[PDB]
Write a protein that binds this ligand. Structure first.
Ligand code: CL
Ligand code: CL
Ligand code: CL
Ligand code: CL
Ligand code: CL
Ligand code: CL
Ligand code: CL
Ligand code: SR
Ligand code: SR
Ligand code: SR
Ligand code: SR
Ligand code: SR
Ligand code: SR
Ligand code: SR
Ligand code: SR
Ligand code: SR
Ligand code: SR
Ligand code: SR
Ligand code: SR
Ligand code: SR
Ligand code: SR
Ligand code: SR
Ligand code: SR
Ligand code: SR
Ligand code: SR
Ligand code: SR
Lengths: 602, 602, 602
């Protein structure tokens, strides 16, 4: 009639306790807890053996674990098939918990790390804090094929946060999404030599990363998000060496030396990421500071990039860096077949080194850019440049040895195509472009604020020599419009029916031009002879001019007209973009940097 | 040998009950519940004191709370460090629960609100229903710095859903993602005067908002998603006044008066949002109806917008509104250094007011647009317009007082650049554009279906006067092609070697043109003299013409040719875009709106 | 003084057991479990009646269910208002669980399916495995209006994964996000005849789908993501027949016959999806292999597509397929008012069939494309084509019967506009385009590597006959530049003031051209007469030429110059793109495919 103590305390004693359902308390045990196997959970007492017994019971009986205290442990723990919800694991700093086919939510991994060994693992709403192991979440030498969803976790205070080394059985599919990774000393997400993995997709999306500083650490530590296939680099190496079909989308990477990195990737997309590189972090690791660094990649797109560098522009403005690989220091594996678009990074610069050959196609597309320096090396079989707004262009087509990565390695004698449409090189009043070695068979160019010169690599080798006419103008008057630079081939049609054809691109300044005396520091010039408010002796802003003897130590000053003709103090006046250095005397001549030659028909 | 009642009912009595693990029931208590502290949970009985005792025990012993009933409470509850899973809190309407460093999942907050006071707070899969407080989730006067993940929650029936006021300690990082907010009477997500916050990122992403109607509420209530820095507005005010580096991405805002709002923002992106504004909601609050409203912002991008307004187009079609700020009613802080792209809103209109000066750069980019009215005021130092498809253009460059926000405030005498490439202004058969006060030093334009006129602000002030030749044509015949509008400077090259140069843009209609009598309502005209199927007397659709006396009260009818020459009833025939109003008699003349002048060479 | 067994085992017996809080164990029962109602949970014993009793108790008492074992069940179970966390349900293969207003997390549905009947249902972090029912998650004939969040679930081994049939009460809002669906035999996400649904939004986002193979299954089985309104198709059918305002964003669809499908959709966006179609799966179901298939849709955008087909290109390269609908085999419902952009699919092809009329507007925009074949049928009222990089163009404007879907059905006599800007048709050395029946009133074209011919549909019907001059060149020399194709109307301006006007587009090859003998397989030609390294007898790569008698069976060989003039073996040499077939003897002539005619002025 009464309850016996030894029956109530037995392993079936809970069956003696009724519940509102009409069932009993034994039927309510849908979980176990570590404390039932001897765990103290005070974060100090060594609970390793209790955790091991909990895992064995959970595995043996296929029952989930619930926990809420803090289990100090001091040697490796191996979990397989476990569902674990809640609690904190506290290691010695870098103590390992391995997982095969485990599902873990709401857990904190303090001063320890998880190593995934395979199966379908799922990690949601966990915290990985203060690991002193190489990585806080490691995939390495998996013993069975895996899939992974690693989402809505927070990671901080560690070295590497997420690290994969591709040796062993493959991860066939993985999603790394919506994680918050911050204040770390290695890489945030690094998937290294994983070319055999992710046949059914690698997606790294909407992760928020902040403060990645590997200063004092080893070589190449400190990347934000990195994905790497396997060398050797080379234009014709097998597809199987590359990591393929992956996507890096919607991530935010703040205060990191090299925010996004791919090497030996193929058929991938880097889409709509926001990056803030900083030269001041990860000092000594050898990484090129930038937002996106791609080495030896093929068949890829970069679409959508915002941000700027946190350091002063005098240290670096490099944001996009696309380069050849290197095998034992020798350039190899030019980037080919790629599309770069929607880079809204006006403070920051783009540096691309590519190539082109008769032995393989390389088609490049660059579109919808807003950047600082646009620097380019290499001459693809076809290259298009559309709606690029930049502050300067530094461009060599078939670059040679000493002119950038892989210079001199490949040439293309067959049909080579280029297009420039709707681009703008402008920094205030200055149009600053440099083009060379563009050995094209056809180059379409229209709508730009500059001309693109093309060149011939041996007589006859690019067909008949032609100059594209990119500018034509109508004037109501007959005199040649003064003070304005026109490219070679420009045609001016007059209302009278006369026509001017520019045979040497440049601007017209009369031989009778005279200016007033100038003093050091002056940024305006005034006419002492000609009517600068006439069309024939006009002065257009943006035109490059030379003021004899006004530069350093009586050299010639090359500058740009900053403001077109105006009258002040009863004198025709222009502003210049650079100050007088050496004073000049009354009735000095000004002239064009590039003096025009034209012929007039009728 | 038997179990004593007073031992079993003691605080350690559960240790007497064995479980299958070999442990005991005391070791299975990984949580507490409010009912253990006296809560009834019937949604009616006042459970405030029980909740307070639960929170104290959870804090004191660092133990999570589990709950599943409905706890009525009637005064403020303050939580710190709590993990709470499940249950409903029911207040009096606007009763407060404050949280510092709390983690809450699967909770319903009914007729109450949560105020975050700091720490790392995390809110997932909760419901915030029927709050009558100002906000359902409030961040205000935090006492410690915070981070927030507020994701996959549902909010409805309230006034403001999410509201931050920036006074107090800062939120260093926050993610507001994948929430569902609907049927509210204030703003859905409003982060106000938060310029000091979010140094490590503000991300508002993939939220779905529906039915925001603040009718009858106070001024500026009813914004969908709003972010605000601090005034005063001004082009040169310190960066520290602006909310910076944030992103508003992938959100859907349906049936809201002003879907997305930023003021005093800098270095931000508004990307891939879908918006359905409605003039009929939030009546009386003073908000400008639109999808995106930006005031006094700098260094920003709007990229990717879809949707349309739910009201009739006769009320409004305004979708994108980018404007100066106002300080005590005076315009201040022009939007500068911005990029607007990928707006696929063909029914809806864009209104932008900007500026340009010698004292600072302003570079604007507008690209890849599909809209209704394109309305623009202001003359940046550089502005590019590319692949804009619109139904009309309403454009003033250096707008003066009375021509829009900040008109007359700033001018730029230095080099001013503009580009129009590949744009289309078309509404059926009509090309409707208006441009004025474009005081540019250089304007590149190509590939448009209209010409852009530029102007001179004082003789000589923009260099030699030139007309860009945007159209050249070849004809196999010598006669000037009739009935088609050509801009000034157009060149026609004939197979014979003759050339025509258009010195006054317009179309050719012979002085001998005669039409048949017309009646009111007629939308075709027929020739009574000339062969409209000849090239010299041709009739091109899209050309603007004048029919003397055919308009209202015998005024001239200005219309557009809707269909080029065809024969019906044995007569040359064209269609017109507007009906005859006043009948016209046989042998009335038709003429161009803009009569051409050209010269012929040879 | 002692505990009585019958009191402890009663429904209030738990109140006798004290807990650390000072409360009792009865107050800790925040849930029930199925085992408390007789469930065995061994995956074999029939637990149907126990599950039913659990659901009744949970409903009656409004209490959540916790579970962790495996409940075999054998007939339908109906849940309403239930919160269920954990456990596995195992059916007979296709046993049904219906849900109204249910919330389910961490559940596995094995060999069974869930049918949603309405209310606010929420499904997170579940597994749907090995269903043999038609669908694993079904929405059909709902009895109350619903909303759905179906997110972070995994589904595999089934026929259809997610299926909606729109009969019954409507889903007003649904989010299907971040699911992982793989290895299935029906569609992954199919929402069929849902035009009345989703008034407040349908969002299908960030789902990862792999291996959809409906081989041997019924007609149209095997779509990845499909959304369908209701027929009949037609340009003027009511808006209420269409599914509207939905979005398909950020999804990945791998190894599926037709990855994304819409029919009878309006005002929708298909944005930033990654697709890998495969002709080898879903054999026999009648689906057109492609990444995006749209039928009879209006007012839509496709923006952002990457991927390629997994089969060999010789089977198919079709990636984007936009077509008319069909009513009982008759074409109906042309796609109108659409924007296609940012397709980075260089290996794969685009096929679009549209139309244009006087009775309705159709404005199309195609921009920023990188594709293989660009195939187009139809003549909209306005169409723009910008920055399209392709390997060939197959284009008919006003296509007739036998020239594609709906050929001959509609024509537009009113103003018809077209624009081609900045496009490139190039495959190595070949520019391969075909255009016909472009009956435009105005066509702006600039910056392309090809000319677009326009046509006249009756004398006078498109205004005066004009040829747009797309290319003008300057030469320092007077002789006509040889060996290079120039379109009709091209103007060459010489430094001397002479001018050449091309009256018949083509290339110049002198009548005195002679080549050395050739043998079968040869891919170079050598001069036996003229100096190919002169400008007048030059040889430009990309130019099409004819070698008499060198083709199959002594026919003429039409080929392309692959490499411009070079000297080897002391002979002027060019390479050709196709090998000699029939040998040719010494002093055979080579000529242009398209011989130029030009006139010289002066
Ligand atoms: Cl190489
Ligand atoms: Cl560096
Ligand atoms: Cl101001
Ligand atoms: Cl309004
Ligand atoms: Cl139809
Ligand atoms: Cl097929
Ligand atoms: Cl001429
Ligand atoms: Sr598997
Ligand atoms: Sr698998
Ligand atoms: Sr911090
Ligand atoms: Sr290859
Ligand atoms: Sr690709
Ligand atoms: Sr300067
Ligand atoms: Sr912190
Ligand atoms: Sr922090
Ligand atoms: Sr509703
Ligand atoms: Sr500034
Ligand atoms: Sr920016
Ligand atoms: Sr009309
Ligand atoms: Sr409802
Ligand atoms: Sr509703
Ligand atoms: Sr598999
Ligand atoms: Sr319609
Ligand atoms: Sr639309
Ligand atoms: Sr985009
Ligand atoms: Sr070939």
């Amino acid at each position: 009639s009464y309850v016996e103590k030894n029956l109530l305390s037995s392993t079936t004693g809970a069956a003696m306790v009724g519940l509102p359902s009409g069932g009993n308390l034994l039927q309510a045990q849908y979980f176990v807890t570590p404390e039932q196997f001897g765990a103290i959970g005070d974060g100090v007492t060594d609970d390793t053996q209790a955790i091991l017994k909990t895992i064995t019971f959970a595995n043996t009986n296929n029952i989930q674990v619930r926990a809420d205290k803090n289990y100090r442990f001091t040697s490796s723990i191996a979990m397989s098939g476990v569902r674990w919800y809640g609690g904190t694991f506290t290691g010695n700093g870098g103590t390992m918990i391995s997982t095969v086919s485990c599902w873990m939510e709401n857990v904190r991994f303090e001063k320890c790390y998880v190593k995934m060994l395979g199966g379908d693992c799922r990690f949601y709403r966990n915290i990985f804090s203060n690991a002193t192991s190489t990585a806080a979440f490691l995939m390495q030498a998996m013993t069975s094929e895996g899939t992974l969803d690693f989402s809505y976790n927070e990671m901080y205070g560690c070295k590497y946060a997420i690290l994969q080394q591709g040796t062993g059985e493959v991860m066939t599919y993985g999603r790394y999404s919506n994680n918050y990774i911050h204040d770390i000393k290695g890489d945030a997400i690094e998937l290294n030599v994983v070319q055999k993995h992710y046949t059914e997709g690698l997606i790294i999306e909407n992760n928020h990363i902040a403060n990645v500083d590997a200063s004092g650490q080893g070589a190449n530590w400190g990347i934000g998000i990195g994905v790497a296939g396997s060398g050797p680099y080379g234009v014709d190496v097998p597809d199987s060496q590359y990591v393929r079909n992956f996507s890096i989308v919607g991530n935010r990477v703040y205060n990191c030396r090299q925010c996004l990195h791919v090497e030996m990737g193929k058929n991938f997309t880097i889409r709509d990421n926001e990056v803030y590189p900083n030269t001041a972090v990860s000092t000594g690791t050898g990484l090129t500071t930038c937002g996106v660094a791609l080495y030896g990649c093929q068949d890829f797109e970069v679409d959508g990039l915002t941000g700027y560098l946190l350091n002063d522009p005098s240290v670096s403005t490099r944001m996009v860096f696309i380069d050849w690989g290197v095998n034992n220091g020798r350039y190899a594996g030019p980037p080919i077949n790629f599309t770069i678009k929607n880079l809204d990074i006006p403070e920051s610069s783009i540096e691309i080194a590519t190539s082109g050959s008769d032995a393989w196609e390389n088609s490049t597309i660059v579109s919808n850019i807003n950047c600082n320096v646009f620097k380019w090396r290499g001459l693809p079989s076809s290259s298009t440049f559309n709606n690029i707004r930049c502050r300067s262009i530094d461009f060599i087509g078939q670059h040679g040895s000493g002119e950038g990565s892989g210079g001199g390695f490949y040439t293309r004698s067959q049909f080579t195509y280029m297009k420039w449409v709707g681009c703008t090189a402008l920094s205030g009043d200055e149009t600053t472009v440099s083009f060379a070695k563009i050995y094209t068979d056809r180059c379409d160019q229209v709508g730009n604020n500059f001309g693109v010169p093309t060149a011939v690599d041996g007589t006859g080798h690019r067909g008949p020599v032609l100059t594209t006419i990119s500018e034509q103008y109508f004037t109501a008057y007959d005199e040649f419009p003064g003070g304005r630079e026109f490219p070679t081939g420009t045609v001016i049609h007059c209302a009278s029916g006369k026509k001017h054809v520019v045979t040497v691109g440049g601007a017209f300044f009369s031989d009778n031009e005279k200016i007033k005396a100038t003093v050091t520091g002056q940024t305006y010039l005034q006419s002492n002879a000609l009517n600068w408010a006439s069309n024939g002796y006009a002065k257009a802003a943006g035109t490059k001019i030379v003021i004899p003897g006004a530069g350093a130590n009586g050299g010639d000053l090359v500058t740009t007209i900053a403001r077109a003709t105006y009258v002040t103090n009863s004198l025709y006046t222009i502003d210049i973009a650079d100050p007088i250095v050496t004073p000049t005397a009354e009735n000095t001549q000004i002239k064009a940097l590039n003096p025009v030659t034209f012929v007039t028909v009728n």
